[PDB]
Amino acid sequence: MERQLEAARYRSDGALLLGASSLSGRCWAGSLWLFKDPCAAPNEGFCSAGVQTEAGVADLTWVGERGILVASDSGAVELWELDENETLIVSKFCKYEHDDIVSTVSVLSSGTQAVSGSKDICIKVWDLAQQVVLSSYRAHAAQVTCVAASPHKDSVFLSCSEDNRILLWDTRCPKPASQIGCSAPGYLPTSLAWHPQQSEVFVFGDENGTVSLVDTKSTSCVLSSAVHSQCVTGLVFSPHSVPFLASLSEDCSLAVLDSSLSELFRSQAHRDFVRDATWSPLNHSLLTTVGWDHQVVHHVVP
Amino acid sequence: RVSSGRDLNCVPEIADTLGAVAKQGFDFLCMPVFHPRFKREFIQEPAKNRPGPQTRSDLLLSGRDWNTLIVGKLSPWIRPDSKVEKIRRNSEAAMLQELNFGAYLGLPAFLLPLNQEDNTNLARVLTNHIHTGHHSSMFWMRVPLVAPEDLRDDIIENAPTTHTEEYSGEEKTWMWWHNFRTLCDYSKRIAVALEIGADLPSNHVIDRWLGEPIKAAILPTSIFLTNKKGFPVLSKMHQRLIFRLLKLEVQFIITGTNHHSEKEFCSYLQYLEYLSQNRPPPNAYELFAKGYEDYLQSPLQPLMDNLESQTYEVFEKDPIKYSQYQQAIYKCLLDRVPEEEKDTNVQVLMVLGAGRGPLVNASLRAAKQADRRIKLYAVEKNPNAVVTLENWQFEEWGSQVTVVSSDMREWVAPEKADIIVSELLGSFADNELSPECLDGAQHFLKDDGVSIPGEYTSFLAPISSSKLYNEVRACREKDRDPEAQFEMPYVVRLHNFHQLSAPQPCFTFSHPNRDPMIDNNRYCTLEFPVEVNTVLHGFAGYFETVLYQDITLSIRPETHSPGMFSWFPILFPIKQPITVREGQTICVRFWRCSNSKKVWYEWAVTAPVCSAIHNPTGRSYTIGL
Amino acid sequence: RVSSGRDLNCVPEIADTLGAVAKQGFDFLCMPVFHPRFKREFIQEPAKNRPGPQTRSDLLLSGRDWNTLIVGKLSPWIRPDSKVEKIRRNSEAAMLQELNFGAYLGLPAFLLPLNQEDNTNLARVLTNHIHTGHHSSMFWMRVPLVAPEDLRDDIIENAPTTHTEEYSGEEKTWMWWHNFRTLCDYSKRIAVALEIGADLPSNHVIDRWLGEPIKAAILPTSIFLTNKKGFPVLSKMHQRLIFRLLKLEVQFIITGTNHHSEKEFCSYLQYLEYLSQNRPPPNAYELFAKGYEDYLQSPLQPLMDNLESQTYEVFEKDPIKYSQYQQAIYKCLLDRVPEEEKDTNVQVLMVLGAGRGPLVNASLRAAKQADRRIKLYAVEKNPNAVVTLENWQFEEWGSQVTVVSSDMREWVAPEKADIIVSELLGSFADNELSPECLDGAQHFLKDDGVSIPGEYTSFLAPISSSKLYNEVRACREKDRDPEAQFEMPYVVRLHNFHQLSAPQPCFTFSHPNRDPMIDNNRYCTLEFPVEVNTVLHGFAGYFETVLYQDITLSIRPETHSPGMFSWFPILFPIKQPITVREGQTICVRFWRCSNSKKVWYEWAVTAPVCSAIHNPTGRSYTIGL
Amino acid sequence: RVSSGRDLNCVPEIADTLGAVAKQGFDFLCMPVFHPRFKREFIQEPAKNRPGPQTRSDLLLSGRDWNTLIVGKLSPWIRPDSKVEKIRRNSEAAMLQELNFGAYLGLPAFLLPLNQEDNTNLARVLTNHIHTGHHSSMFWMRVPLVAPEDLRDDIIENAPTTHTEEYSGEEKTWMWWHNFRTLCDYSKRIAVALEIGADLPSNHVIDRWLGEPIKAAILPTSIFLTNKKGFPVLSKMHQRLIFRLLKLEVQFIITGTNHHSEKEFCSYLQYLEYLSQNRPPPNAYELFAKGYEDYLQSPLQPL
Ligand SMILES: CCc1cc(NC(=O)C(=O)N2C[C@@H](C)CC[C@@H]2c2ccc3sc(C4CCN(C)CC4)nc3c2)cnc1N
Ligand SMILES: CCc1cc(NC(=O)C(=O)N2C[C@@H](C)CC[C@@H]2c2ccc3sc(C4CCN(C)CC4)nc3c2)cnc1N
Ligand SMILES: CSC[C@H]1O[C@@H](n2cnc3c(N)ncnc32)[C@H](O)[C@@H]1O
Ligand SMILES: CSC[C@H]1O[C@@H](n2cnc3c(N)ncnc32)[C@H](O)[C@@H]1O
Ligand SMILES: [Cl-]
Ligand SMILES: [Cl-]
Ligand SMILES: [Cl-]
Ligand SMILES: [Cl-]
Ligand SMILES: [Cl-]
Ligand SMILES: [Cl-]
Ligand SMILES: [Cl-]
């Protein structure tokens, strides 16, 4: 396996999905892995399925239970299908419609469409069944840092880029994008996370290590907390009814926050950037994190 | 054809990628030297101590491949101008690391992006890197023709793209470059990689880049329209732009993924080649003067210096101008000698400045074409050319031509001349002191005599060319004024520049000059209307001469004699470039001064802002009598 | 092979003569531009007004033929230094005329003769011509190896040729040149066309011309001996001289009529070609360094500057030196670890200054050759080479090699080293500050530890090379001391020079240096015996180094390691050349100074005459710590 | 106190005039080297051949007097920037003649006027004169604080003086200087002789000249108000300006005839001296650092 682990996503039945890349050395490629034994990761020997991609992987997301959506460095969006035996991983399609690196992907609520953001300033909507791009938007003025599909609406999603714009979308509207000024022109947004229960509320991290809670109704920065010392790379809510919020950062630390953005758990276990973190559907207090130190850490949250 | 390269931000195997782009026909490859997403920390632990290797090894390619085929790219996560202090300090070290590794590989060029107004700290770090160990490193500044904010789709509900006119704002992307280019003190190792988008702006936004050091033009695959068969093509405006760029001889860089997936990557490059081949082939003038494009040469001084042989040789290879001289002499002969006196009236015809004898042969051909008698004098002060003249006179001309080896201002003629034919003009007409020479030679001209040329006039026009400005600036020599190179003209085949106003006449001389109070000193003021914002760097100079009646010669672009390649335009630069806005008027002053020994030009801009008086007392440039 | 030309003083038809000399195989032709017997008067009438043409026309050849094939010759009747005033002024005018015509033709070279002691006015006129309308014109000074007076037959009754010893007089023909060369202030456009006579003088008279700009060697047909078959050949001494000249890559010029009349003119040129082919083929060292002959380069500073990739590459392409290092490490391993401890005793072996890892591989090979265990540290402060080191360590070396990316003077080692291996030496041994680096790295060396190299020593030798002196003189740059180029050393493959005394050791350093009062400052005085008359222009510098016991490296010409091409010699020049006579001793002083930040060399000649102290306070050259 | 000079355009006897201005207390005298109305022709005959002498002799004063006491003045008829080509060519030679004679006398300074926007050819001729034989010659550019057009009385019926605000226009007289100063490439031998009028402009027009090489301040007798006793005084704003100029240590030049005819010429200079003495005496800081005013020194490096 390549050193730099990028994505860790739990499947509903408990299986863990890993997406890794090699960001140094002779080869700059990537790989996908499925582990039905979670504690066996990242060891390639005790593995359930594995595949080597031509190029690295920037973001990753599940498509149901057998589909794996990949944003590639090659500018491609790639759908890999899982084998009948769930021992092989085969490329269902690989479309080169983005010009630069595809840096983020997110599946819409219906599970039949997806949204992708790329370093080519563009954002693209995809019909996964037809394997085509329905809509292509150029709403930002800098590289798109994150796209996050709404869990409840198939026409709504959030996006954030280095042009300091946070955009709420509604593909039904003629002008789908809408800028959320929050408080006032602050630091660049880097991560987005919808609230699982309330559809009017979300959270975003910035490059200065601050995580903020915003309500679209009030269109104003409801809350903000200086959680990390460096850029915030990911925000993932817990599946429980009372949602815990895991925050990742380039300071090599993980933080767990409550409703009021107060710090609960904190792990210095990673000695490199923390890339992804997913909660186990079999134990809603277990949280699996990955990083560029090739380390897969399982945390127990009180 | 086209020199070109492929821009990729994804390189899994450097050897396989290079082989692929070579088989696709590309000449070079722009690629990242570190992985684009592999952000690095230089201050705070633990990521500070990330174990290497930090990138791929330099052994994977030969030194020649690094030197010729690989163009480095700054990683997109490096933000030297971030409002966050931590990110700024970290990106400083990251940019230094990547630039130092690019120089370590010996790469011919390194791409750095400009996509906001404030690139001050980026410019500071790059300027410090340039002055830390002098190398042959070149730097291409990726500047978009249209800013990404002014290219976005109008799909934001509460942030609409304003549909109103903004002249200066539409050019902001150049301002960026300009400021950056000014912050680095006009480094010759910093150039432009102009990126072209889907929507092309107004023609003035494009003309803005005239006179700028554009080494590369970046075309994405997104801007290519699809053909009926499925091939990639471009709009007619994009094609006009491609031709304009091909004239500047820039390298074209394809970026983005292949969207015309039925074909190969060869299709985009093939469209570019097909455009390049289907351009009108080079005419004789452009064919000869293609190598002289923007080549700075000092003005010749045929009076003070004796010209070499090959200089006269390139003068003689110009059939258009000698045909013009022959026709003028023919018409003058017909107008002076009636038909009933063709065998009784012989004309005294003196060639003042004969060279190696092209004007003598032209006079003979005109005489036999007009069916008249002429006695020829070939006056030349260059004895090395007098050798050629006397060999010609012995072997061919005979006693009809009398060779006179002296200066026309000193020669005591045995008889007075009906016609005097001279070739003493320069690029600025009188910059080689034809007025003084023909004035000294005027006493042996008959009272009803004719001078060919009968008149000449100089023309000036303000130009913008940061390229030529930096070329002049690089002419600083030891043991003289550090700014003397700006206070002297240069004969140059102008290219990659921008005329800012229509040429206007400067100085005019007439021969013969019956005036009692003869004075060749001149003082002229010129007001040039400017319709566009730009930066004045100097003044182009041309001339027009009337040889006889409607027979004229000219290098002035509007009335340029077709196919004549004896003179190139001249250039009077200025020390400091002058910002000019739309509607402003460039007012320039020009003096032609002289004493007993020297003649020189002084000039100074008075509007929209004053400059220093250039070449005062001819301290930097003089023309010897 | 040989580039050559034919010298003729009789040219009836220039085209026929050029075609003949071309079909004979010659590359160029030395011919008069005016008829040799056609004396011209410039002052007194009536001959002053002689009707032209004064010579043949410039139309008779193409510009390329004038530029490449024709070498001009000064007419023999021109005597600028005549005792008669009239002849002096007339010859001034004629010499100016002929030189100006040669420049008008664009000739690549122009021959002027030196055949007496006083050529002062000739030098004055030529110097004025050089500084009047400067072109790329080159001038060959025809100087005979032996004066015609000292070659004449002893057939004058009342004027016998003295058969006694005169060391200085036998070299008078060089003095001529020297004086002339000094009068023209060492013009780069003035060179030597050494004419070789029948009798060759003593070896010192010939060695006099070592270090002089010899562009041409003139051979007459009279000096050629006749072969058994009837072909022309030369004596063994003449052939030795021909080989010595071929090393300098001079052009050979045949003069005189064909005396071996049975054959063609091809025979002389064919003998020269046959000599050129039958020379020992180029050795690898000379093959690589042929292009570097007398090329001045600034010394590398691997400590202050991070070296580029291809520099490390040329360092690694040297199998002899790495074989030597491997053998030294092998012997040290054997001497430190007994046979009965080969599997129990593991050695700490630190490569300080690892580069891209040739010494690491050498250490591994030496370990497996000696059958011993080693743990390797690869210390390197250049991060760009640390990239290569870490790629090697990941892909090949494994955990056996630990790469350390820091300075050896700052690194806090985890364990102490049994052996430390370094290649921090320069051309002058310590000019790259190997002593300071190895002193800072000495604390993590074991009490009984070994340093490879264990010792090194620098060597100096006075040299004579007006060529290299003028090359250094031409390194003057704007914005600094006009004489700073003389106060700094240059790494250069020495060629066309003359060592004046056997090299003597200058500075010596030993590692480890257990001395309590460590001081790397040095002050050395050197007395070099000189057996010949010459002119000191600078001091060549070499080094020897003991890596371990009898394993040594050396660029010193006497003990030079065979086939090693990692270092070229160094050169410390002086501002003013110093005349040295036979028997005199050149006493030079050298200082190695330093402060907290910089190390530099100061030097000054004290005998036979004092010079200025060069590079005081390192004002012109410093080596950064 | 005050270093000062007297500006006269009428000098019948140079010795008598110099003695008079010396007895009046002045330190120098600005006077014409050629008669102001004695226009000369350099091209067209017959006036081209006007018999000499063209001016008074250089023997009439000692070399020291020429070096220290006499400031030359360009004749007012010389118009190098005239729209008429003949007048332009003639004034070029006239200006060269007068400048060369001033340098021949070894005068410490030479006054030249700026009273229009276009002084380009004037600047060209002066720049050529500066670079023709290097001397210690200094040149004072007479620039009015307010242009004569913006100072005239509103007494023209069909050409009224506009009573509206114009910020940049009110400073035009500096622009002139600036352009001139830029055309001569910032010559150290070219300075300002700021002329002060009756009406003082806005404070920004005055502040404009902060940081400019003002060597002389020209005061006419017309701007002096009359005292109850009959002496000459100035307004409070004029006095503030005089203090500001005294801080810069400029030389004050009195021009115009004596209008307070009951007194002598000593009265104007006495008012200036009385203003200079009645200024707060130098404190310790200014006393120590008076010589260090605008003295460039490299920064110390005690480490
Ligand atoms: C028709 C009559 C005529 C023509 C001209 N025309 C020009 O001068 C002119 O535009 N060009 C530009 C182009 C056409 C080439 C020719 C000539 C030009 C200009 C500048 C230099 S410098 C230079 C080097 C020569 C070798 N040496 C050792 C160093 C100086 N050679 C040239 C040659 C001027 N005068 C008269 N009378
Ligand atoms: C074995 C270990 C070793 C060797 C040496 N040897 C030398 O230096 C030396 O003799 N040569 C001469 C020949 C063999 C070639 C290599 C090297 C040399 C010297 C001077 C310069 S200047 C230069 C330019 C490069 C391009 N950049 C942009 C500008 C500077 N490149 C060189 C290269 C010194 N030190 C140590 N440690
Ligand atoms: C054809 S370029 C102009 C020619 O006129 C010659 N020429 C220029 N000035 C004079 C002069 N005053 N008298 C004679 N020939 C001249 C030059 O030497 C050159 O051959
Ligand atoms: C093989 S050329 C000399 C090598 O030693 C390295 N070097 C020189 N001085 C030091 C030092 N003080 N610490 C570490 N490496 C050094 C240089 O970077 C270069 O790679
Ligand atoms: Cl422009
Ligand atoms: Cl353009
Ligand atoms: Cl005309
Ligand atoms: Cl002689
Ligand atoms: Cl230095
Ligand atoms: Cl100001
Ligand atoms: Cl003020």
Question: What's C44-67 look like in SS3?
Answer: CCCHHHCCCCCCCCHHHCCHHHHH
Strands across the sheet with B522-529, in order? B522-529, B585-594, B598-607, B623-624
Q: Which atom of ligand 4 has the smallest separation from the CA of C411? A: 13
Closest CA to B71 of B128, B139, B23, B21: B139
Q: Cα dist. A271→A41, A292, C405 in Å?
A: 18, 8, 19
User: What lines the ligand 3 site, CB under 6 Å?
Assistant: B 302-303, 307, 315, 353, 355, 379-382, 385, 407-409, 423-424, 437
C312 carries a ligand binding annotation: yes
Closest CA to D111 of D120, D122, D121: D122
Taking an 8 Å cut-off on Cβ atoms, the answer to whether B308 and C388 are in contact is no
Which residue has the CA at smallest separation from atom 17 of ligand 2? C567
Tell me, yes or no, if B423 is annotated catalytic.
Answer: yes
Under CATH, which number does the domain B288-454 receive? Answer: 3.40.50.150
What the block records as the tokens of C580 is: 């040295």
Helices (H), B383-423: 383-392
Cα(D189) to ligand 11 centroid in Å equals 20
Subunits close to D (at least 3 CB pairs below 8 A): B
Is the CB of C576 inside a 6 Å radius of any atom of ligand 2? Answer: no
Q: Cα dist. B505→B497, B573, B583 in Å?
A: 20, 18, 21
Chain centre distance of CA D78? 16
B144 interaction partners in chain A (CB closer than 8 Å): none
SS3 labels along C230-287: CCEECCHHHHHHHHHHHHCCCEEEEECCCCCCCCCCHHHHHHHHHHHHCCCCCCHHHH
What count of other Cβ atoms lies within 10 Å of the Cβ of residue A35? 23
DSSP conformational letter for C396 = I
Handedness of CA B4, B9, B15, B19 (dihedral sign): negative
Closest CA to C64 of B310, A282, B422, A155: B310
Residues near ion ligand 5 (CB < 5 Å) are B 464, 498, 534
Q: Which of B101, B310, B390 sits opposite C53 (nearest CB)?
A: B390
User: Which of B390, B432, B436, B487 is an active site residue?
Assistant: B432
Handedness of CA C574, C578, C583, C584 (dihedral sign): negative
Is the CB of C426 inside a 6 Å radius of any atom of ligand 2? Answer: yes
Is the CB of C528 inside a 6 Å radius of any atom of ligand 2? Answer: no
Q: A128: exposed, middle or buried (C-beta count within 10 Å: 0-12, 13-18, 19+)?
A: buried
Taking an 8 Å cut-off on Cβ atoms, the answer to whether B156 and A167 are in contact is yes
Is the CB of C134 inside a 6 Å radius of any atom of ligand 1? Answer: no
What count of other Cβ atoms lies within 10 Å of the Cβ of residue C500? 24
Is the CB of B302 inside a 6 Å radius of any atom of ligand 1? Answer: yes
Torsion angle defined by CA atoms of residues A229, A235, A239 and A245, in that order, rounded to the nearest 10 degrees:
30
Q: Cα dist. B448→B419, B442, B444, B513 in Å?
A: 9, 12, 11, 12
Residues near ion ligand 11 (CB < 5 Å) are D 209-210
Closest CA to C192 of C168, C215, C170, C169: C215
Q: Which atom of ligand 1 has the smallest separation from the CA of B321? A: 1
- Residue C389: closest C-alpha in chain A: A25
Burial A192-230 (b: 16+ CB within 10 A, else e): bbbbeeeeebbbbbbbbbbbbbbbeeeeebbebbebbeb
- The reply to whether B519 touches chain D by the CB within 8 Å rule is yes
Contact C72, B384 (CB under 8 A): no
Place of tokens 């009265």: D267
Which resolution, in Å, applies to this structure? 2.5
Phi, psi of D212 (to 5 degrees): -105, 145
Which among C297, C303, C322, C456 is the best mutation to test ligand 2's pocket, defined by most ligand atoms within 8 Å of the CB? C297
Amino acid, single-letter form, for residue B363: S
Burial B131-151 (b: 16+ CB within 10 A, else e): eeeeeebebbbbbbbbbbebb
d(CA B223, CA B242): 13
Cα(C484) to ligand 9 centroid in Å equals 10
Under CATH, which number does the domain C455-625 receive? Answer: 2.70.160.11
For chain D, what percentages of helix, strand and coil (3-state, to nearest 5) are there?
A: 35, 15, 50
Torsion angle defined by CA atoms of residues A111, A112, A115 and A118, in that order, rounded to the nearest 10 degrees:
110
Elucidation technique: X-ray
d(CA B419, CA B347): 8
Closest CA to C33 of C122, C116, C114, C94: C94
Place of tokens 């910002």: B579
> C383-392 and B85-105 are packed helices; what angle lies between their axes, rounded to 10 degrees?
70
Backbone interruptions in chain A following residues (C to N > 2.5 Å): none
Q: Cα dist. B60→B54, B554, C388 in Å?
A: 15, 58, 10
d(CA D135, CA C387): 65
Which among B310, B361, B421, B424 is the best mutation to test ligand 3's pocket, defined by most ligand atoms within 8 Å of the CB? B424
Closest CA to C66 of C26, C29, C111, C121: C29
Is the CB of C423 inside a 6 Å radius of any atom of ligand 4? Answer: yes
Instruction: Name every residue whose Cβ is closer than 8 Å to that of residue C437 and which is 6 or more positions away in sequence.
Output: C303, C352, C353, C408, C409, C422, C424
Which among B407, B427, B439 is the best mutation to test ligand 3's pocket, defined by most ligand atoms within 8 Å of the CB? B407
What count of other Cβ atoms lies within 10 Å of the Cβ of residue A242? 8
d(CA D105, CA D56): 12
Q: Which atom of ligand 3 has the smallest separation from the CA of B353? A: 5
Is the CB of C460 inside a 6 Å radius of any atom of ligand 4? Answer: no
B residues 453-482 closer than 8 Å to C (CB):
476-478
DSSP conformational letter for A259 = T
Amino acid, single-letter form, for residue A293: D
Set out the domains of chain A in order of their start, with CATH numbers: 1-302 (2.130.10.10)
* CATH class of the structural domain D1-287: alpha beta
d(CA B188, CA C541): 37
C315 carries a ligand binding annotation: yes
| Three-point CA angle C378, C384, C385, nearest 5° | 35
d(CA B349, CA B361): 12
Q: C154: exposed, middle or buried (C-beta count within 10 Å: 0-12, 13-18, 19+)?
A: exposed
d(CA B379, CA B549): 25
For chain A, state the CA radius of gyration: 18
C380 carries a ligand binding annotation: yes
| DSSP-based three-state secondary structure for B240 | helix
Cα(D115) to ligand 10 centroid in Å equals 20
Taking an 8 Å cut-off on Cβ atoms, the answer to whether D43 and B517 are in contact is yes
For chain D, state the CA radius of gyration: 21
Is the CB of C404 inside a 6 Å radius of any atom of ligand 4? Answer: no
Q: Cα dist. C153→B300, C148, C165 in Å?
A: 55, 10, 18
Subunits close to C (at least 3 CB pairs below 8 A): A, B
d(CA D294, CA D211): 11
How far away is chain B from the Cα of A85, in angstroms, using its nearest Cα?
A: 30
Place of tokens 């036999």: B368
Amino acid, single-letter form, for residue B353: G
Q: D156: exposed, middle or buried (C-beta count within 10 Å: 0-12, 13-18, 19+)?
A: exposed
Q: B380: exposed, middle or buried (C-beta count within 10 Å: 0-12, 13-18, 19+)?
A: buried
Domains in chain B: boundaries: 1-287, 288-454, 455-625
For strands A263-267 and A254-257, give the pairing.
antiparallel
d(CA B512, CA B445): 8
Q: Cα dist. B460→B80, B501, B552 in Å?
A: 44, 9, 19
d(CA C75, CA C94): 9
Contact B484, B512 (CB under 8 A): no
Contact B303, B343 (CB under 8 A): no
| DSSP-based three-state secondary structure for D192 | strand
Q: Which of C306, C392, C476 sits opposite B100 (nearest CB)?
A: C306
C321 carries a ligand binding annotation: yes
What the block records as the tokens of D86 is: 């003949």
Q: B124: exposed, middle or buried (C-beta count within 10 Å: 0-12, 13-18, 19+)?
A: middle
Subunits close to A (at least 3 CB pairs below 8 A): B, C
d(CA D160, CA D167): 19
